[PDB]
């Protein structure tokens, strides 16, 4: 970003160089910038994705005997009817496949985005009055957070009543 740089995420900038997991965290304080990953959210996402994928793969049905689908002669009306029913079945299944792929892609893209709107609202609830949404993708915490407070927020153990006495003193 010009000469200073950018740190935003999930709203204006996807993160490169993070193979720990899908969803993650970053922070800035007097102990230096860092990066971490949330195993619970990425594990839930991976489990849902794997279940969705296993729904289709390996669940085929037996089709031992069918009609002849290739011809090398003109025969009449019954051959034309067989070709017509073959074409109609193929067209219907092609439309079904395209619609299924579109629906599954739409639902996956919205699921893996509502799961990040979640854990954002959840962190906002955990921080209560101690953090203000910057709007570029994440929060700004108004108390003197350290390397332990970030970990506590990541775990869910964070107790806002301790630092709520000074957060409003700093922000209001």
């Amino acid at each position, epitope marked *: 970003r*010009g*000469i200073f*740089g950018a*740190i935003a995420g999930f709203i204006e900038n996807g993160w*490169e*160089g993070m193979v720990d997991g899908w969803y993650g965290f*970053r922070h800035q304080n007097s102990e230096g*910038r*860092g*990066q971490a990953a949330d195993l619970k959210s990425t594990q839930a996402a991976i489990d849902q994705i794997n279940g969705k994928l296993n729904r289709l793969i390996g669940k085929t049905n037996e089709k031992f005997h069918q009609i002849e689908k290739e011809f090398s002669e003109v025969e009449g009306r019954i051959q034309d009817l067989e070709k017509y029913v073959e074409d109609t079945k193929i067209d219907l299944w092609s439309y079904n496949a395209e619609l299924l792929v579109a629906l599954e892609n739409q639902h996956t893209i919205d699921l893996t985005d509502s799961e990040m709107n979640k854990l954002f609202e959840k962190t906002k609830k955990q921080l209560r009055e101690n953090a203000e949404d910057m709007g570029n993708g994440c929060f700004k915490i108004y108390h003197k957070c350290d390397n332990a407070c970030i970990g506590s927020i990541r775990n869910g153990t964070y107790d806002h009543n301790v630092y709520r006495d000074e957060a409003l003193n700093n922000r209001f």
Partner: nanobody
Amino acid sequence: VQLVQSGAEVKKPGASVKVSCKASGYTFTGFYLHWVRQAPGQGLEWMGWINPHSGDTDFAQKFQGKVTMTRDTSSNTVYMDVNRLTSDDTAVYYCVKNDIVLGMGVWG
């Protein structure tokens, strides 16, 4: 993410030297590129950084005017031109893909 270089040329004192750094495996215009050099028996001497998204550059305290660098986004590469060669400037040049959170990143 990989950075290759071309710096095998040799020049007489007072001439000019061109070195090229080519980047692959990542978005070229997304990270600051750094130029550093190392001489035998000495620590690494950092030279400067360049933003491939624009023309903004920054240099060290003693590398003003004597070294320049430019970028080509269409071929995703950078060039460094150094003039006024001196016996004390004989060294090996490293190209770096800096990251603001993961450290110095990959080298060349």
